[PDB]
């Protein structure tokens, strides 16, 4: 089961290897759109803060799970920032959790006065007033319970079928990393001109032992030109300098 | 953007009240994925044993300040510890130090941006239009004209509000080219 969009869940993913080819023979996805990284480069990177959001929405709302969108979900249930790094994955779940009488465990917020902020979780259960009339209970006329359930029936149209949406957001190459693509480590070579890739940070140069000491949280050193001058090796926590070959 | 970021540092000291003069910088202790619209806070103070009146407050001091969007120039030493900084909008001397990327300024005159007056209030003026636009006739019409003989009508003297359709119908396409959808409510149209 997926959480109601009005009360969506998020969990951290760490200390694991990401491999997206495993899903090719698992499910057919209607949406797989990446903004921070092109899909073909996903396997070459390593990520430092990876979270997975889990909620279920209506098919017509799939276009709203994107930066810069409007609508009932984008405005009142779940919104992405314009400065979004990640991938939005969605697929048709009509054959997974619909019910003949309607699956009423999936709810969304219909009425709110303010708009949501990125990654905001609005879980209030209070009655909201549409008019100026004060209310305490009442639950009608000019004030209503803000949540509604979707009529997710196996016989409805395509636009009304449930869809399962997973949004993967992350920080890329700016911190010590915990989730890497399907890569293997090799032996490190010093004092030679080497084409290197350190935790997703590539380049050409000569590696040497460094005389610098990084703070416990600092992973990379950068020069006055805003280029890498040193790296803390991801396999053994040594500080190495990198210099152009000629 | 949903993350509650806490920075911190501990310092040894021997003083009675006011914080010492000096300089230091805090470390990125924790980034919490919370997503809560925080507007107010309260402190938690320890209670010492001696009713609700026989309470011993012990001995402590607490300080509160507020953050502003301000540019700072940071000086790193040979070991990467920040040892000084220039507040780029504290005063003309600090402004000059920031402009030249230096903590030493030579004798002379330095031009440093401008004195700018900021607005004190927001003044919004629109025509006093009280009628709602006929969204019902447009979207709840009994019949639509054949595409070969399409109809057009002028809309005027009304207020546009697109949130009324959210609980009316589900739309497959809503694409705006002249204006981004999020700015539609901030404009006024002539034809």
């Amino acid at each position: 089961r997926f959480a109601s969009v009005y009360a969506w869940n998020r969990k951290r993913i760490s200390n694991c290897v990401a491999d997206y080819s495993v899903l090719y023979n698992s499910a057919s996805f209607s949406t797989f759109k990446c903004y921070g990284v092109s899909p073909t480069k996903l396997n070459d990177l390593c990520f430092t803060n990876v979270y997975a959001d889990s909620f279920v929405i209506r098919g017509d709302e799939v276009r709203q799970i994107a930066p810069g969108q409007t609508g009932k979900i984008a405005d009142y249930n779940y919104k992405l920032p314009d400065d979004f790094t990640g991938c939005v994955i969605a697929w048709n779940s009509n054959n997974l959790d619909s019910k003949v009488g309607g699956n009423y465990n999936y709810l969304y917020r219909l009425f709110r006065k303010s708009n949501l902020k990125p990654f905001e979780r609005d879980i209030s259960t209070e009655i909201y007033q549409a008019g100026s009339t004060p209310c305490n209970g009442v639950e009608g006329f000019n004030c209503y319970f803000p949540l509604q359930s979707y009529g997710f029936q196996p016989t409805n149209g395509v636009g009304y079928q449930p869809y399962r949406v997973v949004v993967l957001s992350f920080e890329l190459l700016h911190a010590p990393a915990t989730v890497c693509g399907p890569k293997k480590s090799t032996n490190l070579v010093k004092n030679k001109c080497v084409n290197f890739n350190f935790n997703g940070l590539t380049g050409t140069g000569v590696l040497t032992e460094s005389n610098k000491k990084f703070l416990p949280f600092q992973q990379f050193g950068r020069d006055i030109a805003d280029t890498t001058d040193a790296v803390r090796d991801p396999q053994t926590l040594e500080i190495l300098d990198i210099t152009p070959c000629s | 953007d949903g993350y509650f970021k806490i920075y911190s540092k501990h310092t040894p000291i021997n003083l009675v009240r006011d914080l010492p003069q000096g300089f230091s910088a805090l470390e990125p202790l924790v980034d919490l994925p919370i997503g809560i619209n925080i507007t107010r806070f309260q402190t938690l103070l320890a209670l010492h044993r001696s009713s609700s009146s026989g309470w011993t407050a012990g001995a402590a001091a607490y300080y509160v300040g507020y953050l502003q969007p301000r540019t700072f120039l940071l000086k790193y030493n040979e070991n990467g510890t920040i040892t000084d900084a220039v507040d780029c909008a504290l005063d003309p001397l600090s402004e000059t130090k920031c402009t030249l990327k230096s903590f030493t300024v030579e004798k002379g005159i330095y031009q440093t941006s401008n004195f700018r007056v900021q607005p004190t209030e927001s003044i919004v003026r629109f025509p006093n239009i009280t009628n709602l636009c006929p969204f019902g006739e447009v979207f709840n019409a009994t019949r639509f004209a054949s595409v070969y003989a399409w109809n057009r009508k002028r809309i005027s003297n009304c207020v546009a509000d697109y949130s009324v359709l959210y609980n009316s119908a589900s739309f497959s396409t809503f694409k705006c080219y002249g204006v981004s959808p999020t700015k539609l409510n901030d404009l006024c149209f002539t034809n």
Partner: antibody
Amino acid sequence: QVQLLESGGGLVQPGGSLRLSCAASGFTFSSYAMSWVRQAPGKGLEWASAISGSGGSTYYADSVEGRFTISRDNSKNTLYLQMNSLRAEDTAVYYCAKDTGYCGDDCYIKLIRGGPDYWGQGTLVTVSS
Amino acid sequence: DIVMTQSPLSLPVTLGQPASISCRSSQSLVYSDGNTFLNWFQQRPGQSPRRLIYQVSNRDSGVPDRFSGSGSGTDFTLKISRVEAEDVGVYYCMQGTHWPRTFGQGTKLEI
């Protein structure tokens, strides 16, 4: 099959109280909403009360609100209704029924659309000195 | 509340002939998602009511295949292809689109 067995039938003096209950089997009790309905002799049927599968959110018909209490105990798959301050108008055959809509831990009553799929055998209570 | 008027109050219709029962609502029974929630139930004397037609026209499971529904908006009709002896009893229309849930007064079919 799905089975609901009504009990608590009989007669109680005006102003008193009685408790009705429905046993259930052949169904996942906690996964669906359940309601109490009734019909006075010679009259059609009306809804009295409902609870979601979780046993939390409740609903009462306005004509009986306050006077009636509806409850569920998932550990015994048993639905209960206790009717206090009994009136002559409360003489009726009572039934339990199971809603077609799926309604679990996150489901709220009054958001359910559709009708009952399963109806019980029924039991009658009257009000008489 | 939804108010439903059924017609006729009783239907003394000859065995073996087509028949129909009308259910006219005070308000539309079509939900904005296109899903209707009008339910036709048959209560025979001595029996607890059992649903016959759901969502205006859909046939339920385990019921005679001689019945189907029809209609839209505020006026719906149950159509009976042939009257059978088992049809004697009272038919009710339940309106599931809004709360409180309501029923019509019922149509008593007789041969």
